[PDB]
């Protein structure tokens, strides 16, 4: 029926929006991981200087 | 009709559950990264202050 | 209608495929995280012994 189709269509829409937000979280994680690489390397350099 | 819609509804319920697990996984990585950033910045300060 | 049903089925399958992609991305982000955790632990020891 139309009511069943709309309910599934809305539930799928809610899921698809949650997945786009997760995709963004992943990108942000990739970013933080890179910044940490950099700060860890900085720390490594400084420990090595003494 | 209904039984196809039911099938898809049930399939979506599975995808939505996997999606919750992934959200939780990313939350745990975000937490870890907060801890690492805090640590690394403190340790940098410590080494510099020697 | 059957066309609405087929359209939802395709949409669901697309969402599921993307979710799988994200899952595998998250597996790589976890591995990187693990590396960083190890490296930071190592530095933490050293700095404490400085």
The answer to whether the beta carbons of residues B40 and A40 sit under 8 Å apart is: yes
Phi, psi for residue A49 in degrees, rounded to 5: -80, -10
As a whole number of angstroms, the distance between CA C24 and CA B23 comes to 13
Q: Which of B48, B45, C49 has the alpha carbon at shortest distance from A49?
A: B48
**Which chains have at least 3 CB atom pairs separated by less than 8 Å from chain A?**
B, C
| Residues 6+ positions from B9 with CB-CB distance below 8 Å | A8, A11
Cα separation, C47 vs C14, in Å, equals: 49
Residue A32 DSSP code: H
Residue pair A29/C29 in contact by the 8 Å Cβ criterion: yes
Chain center to CA of B36: 16
Which residues in chain A touch residue B50, judged by CB atoms under 8 angstroms apart? 50
Q: Is the dihedral of CA C37, C39, C42, C47 positive or negative?
A: negative
Helix ranges restricted to H, chain A: 2-48
Partner residue opposite B19 with nearest CB, options A15, A35, A42: A15
With 0-12 CB in 10 A as exposed, 13-18 as middle and 19+ as buried, what is A48?
exposed
């Amino acid at each position: 029926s139309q009511q069943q189709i709309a309910a599934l269509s809305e539930s799928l829409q809610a899921t698809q929006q949650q997945l786009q937000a997760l995709q963004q979280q992943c990108y942000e994680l990739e970013k933080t991981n890179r910044l940490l690489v950099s700060e860890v390397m900085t720390l490594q350099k400084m420990v090595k200087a003494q």
